[PDB]
Structures are given as C-alpha cells and as structure tokens.
Amino acid sequence: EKLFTPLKVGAVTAPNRVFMAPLSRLRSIEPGDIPTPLMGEYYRQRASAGLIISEATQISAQAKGYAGAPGLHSPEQIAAWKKITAGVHAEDGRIAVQLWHTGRISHSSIQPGGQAPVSASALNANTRTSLRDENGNAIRVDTTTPRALELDEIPGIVNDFRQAVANAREAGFDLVELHSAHGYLLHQFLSPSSNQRTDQYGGSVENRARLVLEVVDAVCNEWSADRIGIRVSPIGTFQNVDNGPNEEADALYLIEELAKRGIAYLHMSETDLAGGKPYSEAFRQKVRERFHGVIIGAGAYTAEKAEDLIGKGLIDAVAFGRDYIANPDLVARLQKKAELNPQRPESFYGGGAEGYTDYPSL
C-alpha cells in the first residue's frame, strides 16, 4: 500500500496521498461572496486529507459565475479565508485554494453592473449555471451570451490571477491551484471549440495556451513556483467544451510548457461527471516523462485504481471528490477498509449544514 505514505508537494509535505478534490458547495454569504464559519467547520472536519483543495474561488467579481461561490479579491473575503486556513492548520492539515474565472459559464445578473460575462469569443456556452432564488436556494439558469475580451483587457485578467495569488498567500493558504479545466475561462481559451480569436490568443495551440502560460508565469513570479498547482482536463469533453481534434498532442505541448516553470503539481481531471474514455497507460507515460513534479489523478477513482497507478509510477496522488463530501475521515476509512457513508446528492449545492457538516466520522 502506497496511499498512506508521505509525498513532497512543492513547499509542503503531505502525510498521505488521499487528497480532497475541489468541490463547489455554493454556501457562501451574499452579498460579498464571503466564506462562512460553517465552511470553516467543513474544511476542518476534513483536515486529515493529504491535501485539501478548496472549492473554486473567484479571482475577481467579474470571475463570478455561480451564486454562493466564494471570492478571494476583497478584504472581507481574505479575513474570512484566514480563519478557515487557521482552522485547517490547527488540525495539522494543508490547504490549497483553487482559483478560477468562470468566463462564459455565468449569468449577467451576477456580473458587475449586470452586464454580459466575458470569454475568448462571443458564443454562448449553451449550458446552465447555478444562481439563487428569492429565498436563497440554488436554482439552475441558462448561461448568458458572453462578450469577447478585447486584446487590451487580457493583461488585466493576468493581473487578477496575480493579485488573487498574492491574496491567497496573505490568507494563509499553503498552495494555489489554477483552474484551467472544465470549460471555465482558461480552458475556454485553450479549446478551439470555444476560441475563434484571430489575434495571438487564438488559432495555433501556442496561441490558445498563451493566456494560461502568462498566468502561470505571473503567479510563479508573484509568489514561488513551488506554491503553484494547476488543474487541467485536456482529454475529452467538459461542459460542452471539448479539447479539439488534436487533443493529445495539444495536451503534451501544454504539459511540456508547464514543466519548464517547475511548478508544484499537475492535477488531471480525467473525465466529466458524465464519463469519458479512459486515459491509456501510453498517454499517462507521455505525461509522466514531460512533467517532473507531482501528478494528481482525479475522476471516479477507487483506492484500488489509485494504488495501481501510484504503484506503476504514473501518478503520485489521487483527489477524491464525492467520497470526500460524504466522508470527512476518508483517509482513516480507506486505511481501515471501513464502509463509507452514503452520498446525498440533493445537498451537494447550496443550503446549510444538512448534507455538508452532518456526515459523521468513525
């Protein structure tokens, strides 16, 4: 068994390889998109994880696409996150903040000034996001057609990521995870399906990856490379964003570029919740030989699959999502081979303590 052995992950050392995947639970305070003491308790309950990766967190107000998702741009948000990271650290845990811009997966009603959200191009995502109704309950609503970012707006986006990472450091996070997956802003630029730009930020894979790599360079400079992770989902289709006709070659280009920056980790979201074709061992080997930091696998993993791939030297750790929703002490349960609590999907998004902090530990 290798799941319960330590792993150096950039600036910190995880005592085990059972990581908590980033999970939007949409329970923040509005107005202000502010983390809450209840969120603090939820994360504290899970502090035995090798590493906690937080729910996706806005780099800016414009970044917002979901009602109830927290930010890390305002003083009030920084102060609230400080309490949450202190709680995790009080229990000898480690926590990374996942930072995103939702781009076109958003709605005008939650944008600054109530205006259209932004993206690489001006075509609708043709999906839904989650807002709140008049009583504060999560509701699904069709995405608003975006405006294409103007070329002179791109530096501001890079700066917003940079500033959010500065803020993450002050808030006491151990690492940051850039959300470059699942059809959100960075992935919108990466994918040819969502990027029809004719400037240097569209066309070739070099142009499509230009933005995410500018962001990686900015955040490594702001803090340190050993503090930076990135989540990608470069094979398959996610939230209507596929990865184009040369997805494998384009993925390896991006991974080679990321490797040059010497960042802490590469987190691969292998499938959407609806499923997809499995990664081949050949492709995993091609990834492994290009990236010289920690590789985290994710997507419907079992402990058995995690052990198999860690044992083969293809990944270093596994992030569990839904099992972590339902099992605060997932590490102890997997170590002891104990049964897991049943999941209650109706309370994954929005609401309060029920379905959030009421899954018991052993």
Catalytic residues: 184
When CB distances to ligand FMN are compared, the closest residue is 321
Q: How far is the CB of 97 from ligand FMN (least distance, A)?
A: 11
Q: How far is the CB of 145 from ligand FMN (least distance, A)?
A: 23
Sign of CA dihedral 276, 278, 283, 289: positive
Strand partners, 147: 118
Do the Cβ atoms of 128 and 140 come closer than 8 Å?
yes
Rounded to an integer, what distance in angstroms lies between the CA atom of residue 265 and that of residue 291? Answer: 9
Burial of 336 (0-12, 13-18, 19+ CB in 10 A): exposed
Q: How far is the CB of 325 from ligand FMN (least distance, A)?
A: 7
How far, in Å, are 108, 185, 258, 288 from residue 64 at the CA level? Answer: 10, 11, 26, 34
Q: How far is the CB of 351 from ligand FMN (least distance, A)?
A: 12
Residue with tokens 């058995």: 304
Q: Label residue 47 left, alpha or beta by phi (over 0 means left) and psi (-120 to 50 means alpha).
A: alpha
Sign of CA dihedral 142, 188, 277, 20: negative
- Complex with ligand FMN: residue 87 or 297, whichever CB lies closer: 297
Count CB neighbours of 291 within 10 A.
Answer: 17
Of 138, 183, 154, the closest CA to residue 273 belongs to 183
- Complex with ligand FMN: residue 192 or 299, whichever CB lies closer: 299
- Complex with ligand FMN: residue 261 or 322, whichever CB lies closer: 322
Do the Cβ atoms of 23 and 305 come closer than 8 Å?
no
- Complex with ligand FMN: residue 21 or 47, whichever CB lies closer: 21
Q: How far is the CB of 70 from ligand FMN (least distance, A)?
A: 10
- Complex with ligand FMN: residue 52 or 205, whichever CB lies closer: 52
Collapsing DSSP to helix, strand or coil, 173 comes out as coil
**Which residues make up the interface to ligand FMN (CB under 6 A)?**
21-24, 55-56, 98, 179, 181-182, 231, 269, 273, 298-301, 320-323, 348
